[PDB]
Amino acid sequence: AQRVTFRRRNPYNTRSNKIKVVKTPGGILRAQHVKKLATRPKCGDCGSALQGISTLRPRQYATVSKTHKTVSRAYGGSRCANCVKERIIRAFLIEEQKIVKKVVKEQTEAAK
Amino acid sequence: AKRTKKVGITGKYGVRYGSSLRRQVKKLEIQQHARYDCSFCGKKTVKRGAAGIWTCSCCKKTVAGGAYTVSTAAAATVRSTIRRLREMVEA
Amino acid sequence: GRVIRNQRKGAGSIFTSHTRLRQGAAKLRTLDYAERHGYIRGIVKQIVHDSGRGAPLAKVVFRDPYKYRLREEIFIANEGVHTGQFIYAGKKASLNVGNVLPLGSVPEGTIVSNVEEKPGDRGALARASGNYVIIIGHNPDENKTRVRLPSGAKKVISSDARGVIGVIAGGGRVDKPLLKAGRAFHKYRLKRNSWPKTRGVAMNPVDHPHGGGNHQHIGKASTISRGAVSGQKAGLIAARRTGLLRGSQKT
Amino acid sequence: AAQKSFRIKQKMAKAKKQNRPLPQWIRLRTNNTIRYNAKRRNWRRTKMNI
Amino acid sequence: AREITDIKQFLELTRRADVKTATVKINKKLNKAGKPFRQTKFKVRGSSSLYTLVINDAGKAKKLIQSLPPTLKVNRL
Amino acid sequence: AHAQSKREGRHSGYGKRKGTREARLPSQVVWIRRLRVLRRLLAKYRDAGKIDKHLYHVLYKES
RNA sequence: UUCAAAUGAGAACUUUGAAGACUGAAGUGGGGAAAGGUUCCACGUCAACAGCAGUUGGACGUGGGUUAGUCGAUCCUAAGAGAUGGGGAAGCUCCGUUUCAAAGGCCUGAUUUUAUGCAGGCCACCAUCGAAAGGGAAUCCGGUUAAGAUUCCGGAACCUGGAUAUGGAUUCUUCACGGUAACGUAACUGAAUGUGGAGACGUCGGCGCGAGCCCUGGGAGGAGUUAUCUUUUCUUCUUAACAGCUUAUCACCCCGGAAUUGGUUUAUCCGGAGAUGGGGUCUUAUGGCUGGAAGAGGCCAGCACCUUUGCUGGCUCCGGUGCGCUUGUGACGGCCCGUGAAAAUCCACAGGAAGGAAUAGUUUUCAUGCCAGGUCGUACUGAUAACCGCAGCAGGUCUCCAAGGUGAACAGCCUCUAGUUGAUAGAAUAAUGUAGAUAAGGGAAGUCGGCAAAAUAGAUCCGUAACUUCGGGAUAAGGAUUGGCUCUAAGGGUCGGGUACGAUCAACUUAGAACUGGUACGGACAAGGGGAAUCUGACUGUCUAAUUAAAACAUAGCAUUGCGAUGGUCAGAAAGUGAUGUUGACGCAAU
RNA sequence: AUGGUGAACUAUGCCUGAAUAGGGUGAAGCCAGAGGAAACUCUGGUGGAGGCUCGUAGCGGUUCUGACGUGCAAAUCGAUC
Ligand SMILES: [Mg+2]
Ligand SMILES: [Zn+2]
Numbered sequence A: 001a002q003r004v005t006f007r008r009r010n011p012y013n014t015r016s017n018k019i020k021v022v023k024t025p026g027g028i029l030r031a032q033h034v035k036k037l038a039t040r041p042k043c044g045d046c047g048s049a050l051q052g053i054s055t056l057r058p059r060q061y062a063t064v065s066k067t068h069k070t071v072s073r074a075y076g077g078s079r080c081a082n083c084v085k086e087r088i089i090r091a092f093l094i095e096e097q098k099i100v101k102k103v104v105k106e107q108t109e110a111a112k
Numbered sequence B: 001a002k003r004t005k006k007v008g009i010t011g012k013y014g015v016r017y018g019s020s021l022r023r024q025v026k027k028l029e030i031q032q033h034a035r036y037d038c039s040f041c042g043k044k045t046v047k048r049g050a051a052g053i054w055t056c057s058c059c060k061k062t063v064a065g066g067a068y069t070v071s072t073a074a075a076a077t078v079r080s081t082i083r084r085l086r087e088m089v090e091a
Numbered sequence C: 001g002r003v004i005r006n007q008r009k010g011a012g013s014i015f016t017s018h019t020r021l022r023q024g025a026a027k028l029r030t031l032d033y034a035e036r037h038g039y040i041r042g043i044v045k046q047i048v049h050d051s052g053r054g055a056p057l058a059k060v061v062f063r064d065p066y067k068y069r070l071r072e073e074i075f076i077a078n079e080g081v082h083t084g085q086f087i088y089a090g091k092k093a094s095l096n097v098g099n100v101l102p103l104g105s106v107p108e109g110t111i112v113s114n115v116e117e118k119p120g121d122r123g124a125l126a127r128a129s130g131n132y133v134i135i136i137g138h139n140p141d142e143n144k145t146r147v148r149l150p151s152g153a154k155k156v157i158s159s160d161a162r163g164v165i166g167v168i169a170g171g172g173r174v175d176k177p178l179l180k181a182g183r184a185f186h187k188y189r190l191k192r193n194s195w196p197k198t199r200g201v202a203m204n205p206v207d208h209p210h211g212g213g214n215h216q217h218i219g220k221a222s223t224i225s226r227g228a229v230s231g232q233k234a235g236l237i238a239a240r241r242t243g244l245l246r247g248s249q250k251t
Numbered sequence D: 001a002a003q004k005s006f007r008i009k010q011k012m013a014k015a016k017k018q019n020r021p022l023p024q025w026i027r028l029r030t031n032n033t034i035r036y037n038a039k040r041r042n043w044r045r046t047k048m049n050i
Numbered sequence E: 001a002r003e004i005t006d007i008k009q010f011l012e013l014t015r016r017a018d019v020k021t022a023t024v025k026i027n028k029k030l031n032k033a034g035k036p037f038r039q040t041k042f043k044v045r046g047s048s049s050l051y052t053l054v055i056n057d058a059g060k061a062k063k064l065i066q067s068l069p070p071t072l073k074v075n076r077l
Numbered sequence F: 001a002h003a004q005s006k007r008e009g010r011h012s013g014y015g016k017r018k019g020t021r022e023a024r025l026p027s028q029v030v031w032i033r034r035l036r037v038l039r040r041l042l043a044k045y046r047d048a049g050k051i052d053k054h055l056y057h058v059l060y061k062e063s
Numbered sequence G: 001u002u003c004a005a006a007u008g009a010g011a012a013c014u015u016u017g018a019a020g021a022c023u024g025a026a027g028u029g030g031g032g033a034a035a036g037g038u039u040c041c042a043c044g045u046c047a048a049c050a051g052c053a054g055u056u057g058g059a060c061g062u063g064g065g066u067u068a069g070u071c072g073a074u075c076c077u078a079a080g081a082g083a084u085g086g087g088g089a090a091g092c093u094c095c096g097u098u099u100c101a102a103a104g105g106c107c108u109g110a111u112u113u114u115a116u117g118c119a120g121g122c123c124a125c126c127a128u129c130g131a132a133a134g135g136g137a138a139u140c141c142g143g144u145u146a147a148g149a150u151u152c153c154g155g156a157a158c159c160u161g162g163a164u165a166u167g168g169a170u171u172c173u174u175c176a177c178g179g180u181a182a183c184g185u186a187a188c189u190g191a192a193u194g195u196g197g198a199g200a201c202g203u204c205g206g207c208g209c210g211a212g213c214c215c216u217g218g219g220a221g222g223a224g225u226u227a228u229c230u231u232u233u234c235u236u237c238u239u240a241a242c243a244g245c246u247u248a249u250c251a252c253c254c255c256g257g258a259a260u261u262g263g264u265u266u267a268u269c270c271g272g273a274g275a276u277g278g279g280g281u282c283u284u285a286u287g288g289c290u291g292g293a294a295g296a297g298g299c300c301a302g303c304a305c306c307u308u309u310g311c312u313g314g315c316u317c318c319g320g321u322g323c324g325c326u327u328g329u330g331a332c333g334g335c336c337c338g339u340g341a342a343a344a345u346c347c348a349c350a351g352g353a354a355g356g357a358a359u360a361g362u363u364u365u366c367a368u369g370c371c372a373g374g375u376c377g378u379a380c381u382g383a384u385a386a387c388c389g390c391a392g393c394a395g396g397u398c399u400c401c402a403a404g405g406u407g408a409a410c411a412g413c414c415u416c417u418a419g420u421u422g423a424u425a426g427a428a429u430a431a432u433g434u435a436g437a438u439a440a441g442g443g444a445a446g447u448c449g450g451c452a453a454a455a456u457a458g459a460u461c462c463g464u465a466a467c468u469u470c471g472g473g474a475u476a477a478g479g480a481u482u483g484g485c486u487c488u489a490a491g492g493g494u495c496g497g498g499u500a501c502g503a504u505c506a507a508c509u510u511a512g513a514a515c516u517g518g519u520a521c522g523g524a525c526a527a528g529g530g531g532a533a534u535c536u537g538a539c540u541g542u543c544u545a546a547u548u549a550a551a552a553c554a555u556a557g558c559a560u561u562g563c564g565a566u567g568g569u570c571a572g573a574a575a576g577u578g579a580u581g582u583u584g585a586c587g588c589a590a591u
Numbered sequence H: 001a002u003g004g005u006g007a008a009c010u011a012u013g014c015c016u017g018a019a020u021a022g023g024g025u026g027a028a029g030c031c032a033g034a035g036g037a038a039a040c041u042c043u044g045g046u047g048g049a050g051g052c053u054c055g056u057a058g059c060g061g062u063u064c065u066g067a068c069g070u071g072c073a074a075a076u077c078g079a080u081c
Helices: A081-111 B008-013 B019-032 B073-089 C005-011 C181-187 D006-017 D024-028 E007-013 E058-067 F002-006 F027-048 F053-062
Strands: A019-023 A029-033 B046-050 B053-056 B061-064 C039-048 C057-061 C072-076 C086-090 C111-113 C133-139 C144-148 C154-158 E021-032 E035-045 E050-055 E073-076
Touching: B008 B019, B061 C039, B073 C111, E007 E035, E007 E050, E007 E058, E035 E058, E050 E058, F027 F053
Parallel strands: E021 E073
Antiparallel strands: A019 A029, B046 B053, B053 B061, C039 C057, C039 C086, C057 C072, C111 C133, C133 C144, C144 C154, E021 E035, E035 E050
């Protein structure tokens, strides 16, 4: 039934003043201050959290290696697997449709 | 069973604000919280986020709309008026 | 006496606008060169709520015609506009809702919103929810267009003024009674501090023209002249008639 | 307060140096009239207003 | 603050030219209720980390005591 | 001693109650236990094969 | 409050011991913010102050005491403040913060007379100040002082910046491979430019999980009671930051193709845009194991001593339960004419500039190895005595942690930890007072007036009118029961079958029945008096701080009036000036 | 009358934080059942809405026209609310 105190001069229950009670090897209960939780990175278009990427605080993405921050595929660490598939599909169909419109319209003008 | 006879969604107001004023609100609250039909994915999943903003939970599509119904009647007659004026410009 | 509440609003000390969460300046696209002779296609990214107004706003994205850049626009969403749409902005752009077209290049009877009244203002009349403009008649030579305003006014503006075809989203926002004092509290928590309103007749004579007296009353006519000065203009400004509206507009 | 600016703590050090009675030998001076310290200040009687 | 399992790496790490001290600690542990054994921990002080190699076999543990280089300052406690 | 005594049913009469029936034990808590037991029972029957998906479905809606 | 001892000239008041008490965890406890400034601690000491006293003190005299890369500030921006270029103003000064400015600076080259002239390209934002509760790089445990510690000591870490070599990785297919895939790894060239993400966000409701505490069983120790009983009551059995491995609801991938529709939540949503099912991938909150680390801390036993003092031994283990309390977190739902900040900073992606390989090259997003981390703050109180109230003032002053019982209850009452036992005392018990109470018979006759007081009161069952905007009124009104003890019944989890039941374990929940007593039992505490009407305000809300809380004001709803921007309304001495206005009649302004 | 100083009290706006037991009632949505000349009506669950309600902390300040009224206090104290 031991009671704890803040270990810093901020007395108020603000967002960056979170504490949790642990038991130290001294047999006593201290409130140890905890950092804010990290939000996952999101896809550019869909906005869903994209898997394979570590969830860290923004400054902590500088001391982490490259394999934790991106996936192999094109637009890897930024876009979804299916969104990358979507623009792969979309790009092909209408770069092939343009060269269909290109040959179709030149036929109409050539007839006249 | 049938918990209320006529107050419906406006039971939350209890005995306040007058009977007629409670049933103006009931009509618009019924529409603004109703689920509407997705014109892109074909599902009954369109919900109001905020006045004029109707997001379909499936297919994640947002359409601009009226305050309390997805498509106001005055807007729909506009969409047909533009159409008939359009189909004659390139007639 | 003392200066009165409508006099104290011009100091703009506490009577300013609340603008922390307001999205931006919802203007039209600029009339640089690519609309006056052709068009340019744009995409709608997201339609979002705006604190302070009841009409949603759209984020319309265009490609920069002079740099490898993706300049984004803040338009007032037309009812019907959806995320993922394609938006065409030019002179030869089609007559479809969501497109930005000049008044002189649209047929008579067209429904247009977010309409400049001087070409290049990037936005003007018919901005509020459920409001639109209609073209009445063009004057080709000395180019002009005759249109009707949401107030019911007929206004002639330059034929090259622009406007998004259709009607602003969010129509009928006012058909719902707030039913509650505190509902008006949140309507004006994000608009401005013009709520609540003590009556001027429930006041002291030092504080208002209408204050004082053994009974709560005006005392003199509440219909006030144009030539009245700041301090005397409290009541029904410049009223031509008053009473109850019997008859039509008679405009 | 605990957290304080250097101005405040510097000016408190000035007021802590000055807080003690008259030196004893000064009243033994020729033609001396100062009988005690008339600017002595205590934390419970009057505040510094700094 | 790190663990290493292979004895091969410990002998390489103990001649890392930044190692100055190392400790040998004796712990009386209990594997089964039938008989206790002696668990000894070999620690080496690196410039940034403390590698603790835990050895449970008493015979193999003894072979590692004289396997350390003579230039190493070994602490036994 | 009192805790042990309460285990045989003593000191639980009408004169020993100050909170309502709901306050002492919430009704929604009672239903949650009821509905979860029936669902762990129906689900175990499908796994054992003692029931087909059609009978399992009607009782779920009955339960 | 009391008894005794010590000190002293002197003790109701100081110290120590003992006894009796209180605060009772939204404390009379432990920390802070604002404020104070040395009040903190030691020694000496009582002329003055502590409205009695005084040997004591927040007093007096003399001194000691605040140790940081990691905690803050320092940086960003918010509402705002504010230079400049200018424009007014006789003028002190006012406007205005990107405005009618030639407004600025980074990478790479070229010469190694060499400073950076000179090759170039890129850039158009734009002073600065403004939060010790916003945003934000990184430290934990144990020990230590008279007084300081996430700052000292010991140990063990991490971050930023900067030099830097080795190992590793890769190439003659010049700048990696594996998996159908979601994706993985120790790395695994990528300049300008552009795009994306994190930073980055409401509140309430219930539900799942974690942490600490609470409760509890066995065992190893210590203490208490023991006329009697009690395998008994109290108490110790702990594991940090950081690191490795593993651990996940959600989400996603492959197969396959669904009505006799199925799956499924406490809460009803999802599936031919691919359901159920089978198999996998991922976030690492969180949990487990291991390193740290038992060497620390805790609890005991034995042996010496003026002693600076010690030494040596053990044990520090294994579980259970939950609508419990507090707190964190997840997936959802409700709500809005409310939809609930900004920037610094950090990362990723697209793009292909350039540089590169064979007797040899390249990567410092892999590991290890080297050096530095400035300045100011840091003691103490934080309040019936350190702040503000003329004071050591029954007032005021923002916040964190929160044990057991009764009980719905961070109610009221009792107790544990911790802290107090402070408020001038002594003797008697007149009147009159303040506060607390009880009264025969009557029951408002008192009084302006039931003012004051009394009565009712918890819970369970029964029953409930007029009227009504159909939501209420309503706990209407009005009845019964309530303890203790001995029982009875029902309400769960997990394991057991050739491809009905049995065993084990564990919650208080309800209902019923006998018996029992001076008819008692929400036994203290806690806790609505009710009804019939008239006037008035619709309601919730707000105000005369310190004589008026209302029929006043507000309010929704209703209605009117002005204005399309060369405008309405208003501000300004003036201005290349302003508010609404980041606005646009479903608006703004005035009634 | 001239020139200055104050929003450390208080008023209102804006910015950024923070706080708020335990009960009663039981709105939409959802499930099942019953009566049924159909039409439709009824019942029991579920759920947890409201500028709802009893009532703590908090914020306030109705009555005793109580205490006090050369006070503890230049506005406090107790009960009731
Ligand atoms: Mg029939
Ligand atoms: Zn859809």
